[PDB]
């Protein structure tokens, strides 16, 4: 089970902007539109870091 094209490209935007600051990442408004928790974003980034860098 992989992730979608938009999801991957959206995660690229978050990683390049903040890095690994999940608190800043979920208090962000422009990139993290759907106000997901720290646990949601980091889990999806771990899956992203497996397929990519």
């Amino acid at each position: 089970r992989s992730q979608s094209e938009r999801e991957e490209e959206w995660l690229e935007k978050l990683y390049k902007k903040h890095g690994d600051d999940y608190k800043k990442m979920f208090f962000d408004k422009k990139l993290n539109i759907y106000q997901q928790s720290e646990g949601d974003l980091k889990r999806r980034l771990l899956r992203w870091k497996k397929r990519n860098g």
Binding site: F26, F27, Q35, S37
Partner: protein
């Protein structure tokens, strides 16, 4: 000793007294450990560098970060009545208690080691004045902000549900549920009191 204010602008006055006083080690005392999640989460998001202490976090997480205040010079923490009990720092000048305390009797005894004022609509030292048109107009900023994030809406809610429970679970005949809920919701800035 105290400052007489209505329940609408109790929080709005506090944000004034923090912004005007940004050099001194000052402590607020609030009731609920749930509540000081809320007033900490606003002030870092309306950008005051505050600190936060409450029961809902770990011990050395509480301790080592409380340790940062004790060796500091400038800033400010927000803590409960309970978690700060027994651990007074002599390096402090303002103890403002927002709430009626847990024990009102034994509260005066814990002063004498630190200048004091409180906040009360109907409910030694003197008061202070306040020029009423000086409070910050952030309530326009906050009402948009309490509607936009849902995390800040949830923590506003628990900061309200837990505020009044503790207000009812108190000792005194004076501080018993007379206060109108139209204005305590405005201290957490709602349109409707949840």
């Amino acid at each position: 000793g105290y400052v007489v204010c209505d329940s609408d602008k109790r929080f709005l006055l506090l944000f004034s007294f923090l912004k005007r006083n940004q050099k001194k080690k000052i402590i607020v005392f609030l009731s609920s450990c749930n509540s000081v999640k809320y007033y900490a989460e606003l002030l870092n998001y309306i950008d005051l560098p505050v600190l936060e202490l409450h029961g809902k976090q770990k011990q050395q997480k509480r301790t080592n970060t409380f340790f940062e205040f004790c060796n500091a010079e400038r800033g400010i923490l927000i803590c409960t009545d309970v978690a700060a009990r027994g651990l007074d720092i002599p390096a402090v000048d303002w103890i403002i208690q927002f709430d009626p305390p847990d024990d009102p009797r034994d509260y005066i005894h814990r002063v004498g080691r630190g200048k004091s004022l409180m906040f009360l609509t109907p409910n030694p030292l003197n008061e202070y004045e306040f020029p009423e048109n000086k409070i910050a107009n952030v309530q326009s900023q906050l009402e948009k902000l309490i509607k936009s994030n849902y995390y800040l809406h949830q923590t506003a809610k628990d900061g309200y549900r837990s505020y009044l429970q503790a207000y009812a679970s108190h000792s005194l005949k004076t501080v018993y549920q007379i206060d109108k809920l139209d204005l305590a919701k405005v201290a957490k800035s709602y349109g409707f009191p949840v």
